[PDB]
Amino acid sequence: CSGNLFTQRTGTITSPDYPNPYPKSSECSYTIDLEEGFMVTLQFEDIFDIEDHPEVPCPYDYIKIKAGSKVWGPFCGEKSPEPISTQSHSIQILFRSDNSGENRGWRLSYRA
Ligand SMILES: [Ca+2]
């Protein structure tokens, strides 16, 4: 999972094993790298199941998305963020899980 470069203008990224449980203690990243000027809308499709908490924001596990200075997330829980219009050509999706949990992960489809 660590060393995903995406060079095509549309595509689809998922948590390892999605929709099986994603592995524990996992520092997985995903890069979308396209020519500057391309503009990337990210959509979460299907089931967003990242481990969550009732009272405290997204400890444990989480997807973060970084472009330029802009940083979306960290996200977790059973409901995915609304589509993200990054207005960027180069996004780092970072996903991170701790050492326990039984969540099935996430799935996004990008396009530019
Ligand atoms: Ca976990």
PDB file of C-alpha atoms and ligand atoms in Angstrom:
ATOM      1  CA  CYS A   1       0.000   0.000   0.000  1.00  0.00           C
ATOM      2  CA  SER A   2       3.007   2.294   0.547  1.00  0.00           C
ATOM      3  CA  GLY A   3       4.190   3.506  -2.825  1.00  0.00           C
ATOM      4  CA  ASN A   4       1.107   4.193  -4.804  1.00  0.00           C
ATOM      5  CA  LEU A   5       1.677   6.732  -7.565  1.00  0.00           C
ATOM      6  CA  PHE A   6      -1.341   7.480  -9.830  1.00  0.00           C
ATOM      7  CA  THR A   7      -0.482   9.220 -13.142  1.00  0.00           C
ATOM      8  CA  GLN A   8      -3.766   8.812 -15.076  1.00  0.00           C
ATOM      9  CA  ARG A   9      -6.381  11.602 -14.908  1.00  0.00           C
ATOM     10  CA  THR A  10      -9.230   9.436 -13.538  1.00  0.00           C
ATOM     11  CA  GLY A  11      -8.767   6.633 -11.093  1.00  0.00           C
ATOM     12  CA  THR A  12      -9.816   4.890  -7.961  1.00  0.00           C
ATOM     13  CA  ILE A  13      -7.942   4.427  -4.707  1.00  0.00           C
ATOM     14  CA  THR A  14      -8.878   2.200  -1.743  1.00  0.00           C
ATOM     15  CA  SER A  15      -7.652   1.136   1.683  1.00  0.00           C
ATOM     16  CA  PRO A  16      -5.760  -2.159   1.604  1.00  0.00           C
ATOM     17  CA  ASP A  17      -8.046  -5.106   1.340  1.00  0.00           C
ATOM     18  CA  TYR A  18     -11.053  -2.796   0.957  1.00  0.00           C
ATOM     19  CA  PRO A  19     -13.574  -3.855   1.763  1.00  0.00           C
ATOM     20  CA  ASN A  20     -11.938  -6.431   4.084  1.00  0.00           C
ATOM     21  CA  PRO A  21     -10.532  -4.959   7.288  1.00  0.00           C
ATOM     22  CA  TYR A  22      -7.473  -2.754   6.587  1.00  0.00           C
ATOM     23  CA  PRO A  23      -4.314  -3.921   8.294  1.00  0.00           C
ATOM     24  CA  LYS A  24      -3.200  -2.555  11.684  1.00  0.00           C
ATOM     25  CA  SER A  25      -0.267  -0.199  12.366  1.00  0.00           C
ATOM     26  CA  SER A  26      -0.373   1.009   8.795  1.00  0.00           C
ATOM     27  CA  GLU A  27       1.224   4.141   7.327  1.00  0.00           C
ATOM     28  CA  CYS A  28      -0.145   3.969   3.800  1.00  0.00           C
ATOM     29  CA  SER A  29       0.140   6.896   1.359  1.00  0.00           C
ATOM     30  CA  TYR A  30      -1.205   7.480  -2.151  1.00  0.00           C
ATOM     31  CA  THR A  31      -0.033  10.126  -4.558  1.00  0.00           C
ATOM     32  CA  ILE A  32      -1.906  11.513  -7.530  1.00  0.00           C
ATOM     33  CA  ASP A  33       0.614  13.135  -9.738  1.00  0.00           C
ATOM     34  CA  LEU A  34      -0.484  14.922 -12.843  1.00  0.00           C
ATOM     35  CA  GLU A  35       0.799  17.901 -14.834  1.00  0.00           C
ATOM     36  CA  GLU A  36       0.193  21.309 -13.188  1.00  0.00           C
ATOM     37  CA  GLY A  37      -3.103  22.890 -14.159  1.00  0.00           C
ATOM     38  CA  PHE A  38      -5.130  19.688 -13.913  1.00  0.00           C
ATOM     39  CA  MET A  39      -7.848  20.070 -11.238  1.00  0.00           C
ATOM     40  CA  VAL A  40      -8.846  17.109  -9.034  1.00  0.00           C
ATOM     41  CA  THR A  41     -12.235  16.275  -7.575  1.00  0.00           C
ATOM     42  CA  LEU A  42     -12.086  13.353  -5.096  1.00  0.00           C
ATOM     43  CA  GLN A  43     -15.304  11.415  -4.262  1.00  0.00           C
ATOM     44  CA  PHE A  44     -15.822   8.837  -1.612  1.00  0.00           C
ATOM     45  CA  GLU A  45     -17.808   5.970  -3.047  1.00  0.00           C
ATOM     46  CA  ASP A  46     -19.488   3.037  -1.258  1.00  0.00           C
ATOM     47  CA  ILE A  47     -18.766   2.310   2.400  1.00  0.00           C
ATOM     48  CA  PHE A  48     -16.614   4.615   4.521  1.00  0.00           C
ATOM     49  CA  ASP A  49     -15.766   2.646   7.662  1.00  0.00           C
ATOM     50  CA  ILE A  50     -12.732   4.109   9.506  1.00  0.00           C
ATOM     51  CA  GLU A  51     -12.461   3.714  13.253  1.00  0.00           C
ATOM     52  CA  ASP A  52     -13.990   6.581  15.165  1.00  0.00           C
ATOM     53  CA  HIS A  53     -14.888   7.809  18.650  1.00  0.00           C
ATOM     54  CA  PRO A  54     -18.036   9.302  20.087  1.00  0.00           C
ATOM     55  CA  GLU A  55     -16.401  12.194  22.072  1.00  0.00           C
ATOM     56  CA  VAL A  56     -12.944  12.911  20.535  1.00  0.00           C
ATOM     57  CA  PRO A  57     -12.151  13.664  16.869  1.00  0.00           C
ATOM     58  CA  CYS A  58     -10.606  10.813  14.909  1.00  0.00           C
ATOM     59  CA  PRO A  59      -7.978   9.425  17.160  1.00  0.00           C
ATOM     60  CA  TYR A  60      -6.699   5.965  16.183  1.00  0.00           C
ATOM     61  CA  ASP A  61      -7.282   5.655  12.498  1.00  0.00           C
ATOM     62  CA  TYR A  62      -7.774   8.254   9.784  1.00  0.00           C
ATOM     63  CA  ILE A  63      -7.537   9.408   6.191  1.00  0.00           C
ATOM     64  CA  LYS A  64      -5.861  12.768   5.612  1.00  0.00           C
ATOM     65  CA  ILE A  65      -5.502  14.496   2.195  1.00  0.00           C
ATOM     66  CA  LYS A  66      -2.847  17.065   1.572  1.00  0.00           C
ATOM     67  CA  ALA A  67      -2.351  19.334  -1.463  1.00  0.00           C
ATOM     68  CA  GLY A  68      -0.129  22.404  -1.600  1.00  0.00           C
ATOM     69  CA  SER A  69      -0.550  24.064   1.766  1.00  0.00           C
ATOM     70  CA  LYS A  70      -4.225  22.900   1.844  1.00  0.00           C
ATOM     71  CA  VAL A  71      -4.986  19.937   4.191  1.00  0.00           C
ATOM     72  CA  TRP A  72      -8.375  18.126   4.228  1.00  0.00           C
ATOM     73  CA  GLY A  73      -9.072  15.893   7.264  1.00  0.00           C
ATOM     74  CA  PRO A  74      -8.186  13.868   9.297  1.00  0.00           C
ATOM     75  CA  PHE A  75     -11.416  11.942   8.617  1.00  0.00           C
ATOM     76  CA  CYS A  76     -13.006   8.869  10.229  1.00  0.00           C
ATOM     77  CA  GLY A  77     -16.358   7.315  11.102  1.00  0.00           C
ATOM     78  CA  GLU A  78     -19.142   5.672   9.076  1.00  0.00           C
ATOM     79  CA  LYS A  79     -19.883   8.688   6.865  1.00  0.00           C
ATOM     80  CA  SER A  80     -17.433  10.063   4.261  1.00  0.00           C
ATOM     81  CA  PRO A  81     -16.790  13.784   3.702  1.00  0.00           C
ATOM     82  CA  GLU A  82     -18.648  15.361   0.803  1.00  0.00           C
ATOM     83  CA  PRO A  83     -16.714  15.371  -2.520  1.00  0.00           C
ATOM     84  CA  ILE A  84     -13.440  17.332  -2.357  1.00  0.00           C
ATOM     85  CA  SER A  85     -12.591  19.894  -4.988  1.00  0.00           C
ATOM     86  CA  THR A  86      -8.823  20.235  -4.429  1.00  0.00           C
ATOM     87  CA  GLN A  87      -8.054  22.629  -7.284  1.00  0.00           C
ATOM     88  CA  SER A  88      -4.694  20.926  -7.280  1.00  0.00           C
ATOM     89  CA  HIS A  89      -2.825  18.556  -9.653  1.00  0.00           C
ATOM     90  CA  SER A  90      -0.856  16.781  -6.960  1.00  0.00           C
ATOM     91  CA  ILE A  91      -2.554  15.246  -3.982  1.00  0.00           C
ATOM     92  CA  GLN A  92      -1.104  13.128  -1.182  1.00  0.00           C
ATOM     93  CA  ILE A  93      -3.806  10.933   0.289  1.00  0.00           C
ATOM     94  CA  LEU A  94      -2.408   9.699   3.633  1.00  0.00           C
ATOM     95  CA  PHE A  95      -4.215   6.907   5.470  1.00  0.00           C
ATOM     96  CA  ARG A  96      -3.206   5.712   8.950  1.00  0.00           C
ATOM     97  CA  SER A  97      -4.414   2.986  11.313  1.00  0.00           C
ATOM     98  CA  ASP A  98      -3.356   2.024  14.868  1.00  0.00           C
ATOM     99  CA  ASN A  99      -2.910  -1.466  16.319  1.00  0.00           C
ATOM    100  CA  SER A 100      -6.532  -2.656  16.673  1.00  0.00           C
ATOM    101  CA  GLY A 101     -10.013  -2.328  15.230  1.00  0.00           C
ATOM    102  CA  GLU A 102     -12.237  -4.040  12.701  1.00  0.00           C
ATOM    103  CA  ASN A 103     -13.081  -1.457  10.096  1.00  0.00           C
ATOM    104  CA  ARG A 104     -13.432  -2.150   6.403  1.00  0.00           C
ATOM    105  CA  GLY A 105     -11.766   1.091   5.208  1.00  0.00           C
ATOM    106  CA  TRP A 106     -12.688   3.557   2.478  1.00  0.00           C
ATOM    107  CA  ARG A 107     -12.847   4.042  -1.225  1.00  0.00           C
ATOM    108  CA  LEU A 108     -12.476   7.118  -3.294  1.00  0.00           C
ATOM    109  CA  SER A 109     -12.578   7.657  -7.030  1.00  0.00           C
ATOM    110  CA  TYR A 110     -10.678  10.701  -8.364  1.00  0.00           C
ATOM    111  CA  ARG A 111     -10.932  12.561 -11.713  1.00  0.00           C
ATOM    112  CA  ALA A 112      -9.271  15.636 -13.329  1.00  0.00           C
TER     113      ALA A 112
HETATM  114 CA    CA B   1      -7.737   0.721  14.250  1.00  0.00          CA
END
